[PDB]
């Protein structure tokens, strides 16, 4: 119930079926324009669910106008690289990030692996995964990176 499901596919592309079967600064995004999970990428991938303006979780599947995603609250307090990605209503992949790449691109060649990576980024299927372990701001991060 925490996931926004505003998915218009009038162009009949089929991005919704693959969900069930087999830049800009990260601030606040309106749930009504989101389809599917919202992944924010600290040095590791984190899932963001729908909330109101205070941070209280909502369970309306992103239907109401007040449902938002607090991307800024997920920003690392230490100030490291940060970015979030998601799919919007008409099936396009959106990213946010500072001027590391935009969304999940730690490197212009690498990408943080996460369950819906092939759903948001189909062009990175043939990418090679590298197990990464590093400390960012006093916190250990274990994650995999898909590179060329």
């Amino acid at each position: 119930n925490r996931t926004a499901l505003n998915c218009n596919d009038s162009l009949q592309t089929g991005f919704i079926t693959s969900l069930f079967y087999a830049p800009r600064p990260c601030d606040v995004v309106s749930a009504r324009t989101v389809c599917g999970p919202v992944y924010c990428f600290t040095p590791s991938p984190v899932v963001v669910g729908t909330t109101d303006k205070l941070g209280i979780p909502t369970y309306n599947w992103g239907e109401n106008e007040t449902d938002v995603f607090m991307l800024e609250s997920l920003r690392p307090p230490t100030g490291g690289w940060f970015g979030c990605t998601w799919m919007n209503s008409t099936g396009f992949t959106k990213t946010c990030g500072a001027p590391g790449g935009s969304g999940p691109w730690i490197t212009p060649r690498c990408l943080v692996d996460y369950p819906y990576r092939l759903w948001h980024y189909p062009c990175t299927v043939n990418f090679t995964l590298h197990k990464v372990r590093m400390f960012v701001g006093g916190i250990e991060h274990r994650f995999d990176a898909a590179c060329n």
């Epitope: 499901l5 505003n6 596919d9 009949q12 919704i16 079926t17 069930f20 599947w61 239907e63």
Partner: antibody
Amino acid sequence: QLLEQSGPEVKRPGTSVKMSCKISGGASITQAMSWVRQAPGQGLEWMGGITPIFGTVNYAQKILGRVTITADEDTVSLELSSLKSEDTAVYYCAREVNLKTWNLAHPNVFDVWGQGTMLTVSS
Amino acid sequence: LTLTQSPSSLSASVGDRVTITCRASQSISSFLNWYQQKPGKAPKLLIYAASSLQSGVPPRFSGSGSGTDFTLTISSLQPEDFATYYCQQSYSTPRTFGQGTKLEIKR
């Protein structure tokens, strides 16, 4: 975009029938689907609907005992048991959608209709 | 909730302005839809959300109303508009339809 329905059926009283409805393309079932029946020379009457994401199913109070609505990847079906002469009607599947927000959790309008499957209950 | 349409039968000429009312036994907010059914064919969506025109529907079709009383308006009747018109509420848990309005054309 387009909906295919199974062919017309003639059934003796007391038996059961299963009517099915397909997307008629390479697509899989995503949106909520509903069944609307129309007796000959009569009005439209909602019987039941299924929501694939929730898996939940609703029915009409008059037929709750003998109707079941099932769905898989590409086919929604409607089964009626203990058929009687009053079940003679045309049976439509209709995709229920939210045209304001396209939210899968709150479908509130039938935007695409199958061309109907006519059932006759007769001995 | 219960939907009652007025009138049940309608007769008008090409170019006439016609209206059809739907009356809900209780408030349905704006979850009212209009459908057009030509003989032998499946119903076709005309107006959703009581007032929003569906993509591809000619602009002479229009809807208005809220709460318990609703209206479908055809600004200039055309021969293709010969059909039966149904209102449908999607507010409560069992979806319901109006009895339907048959629209005959005089010439």
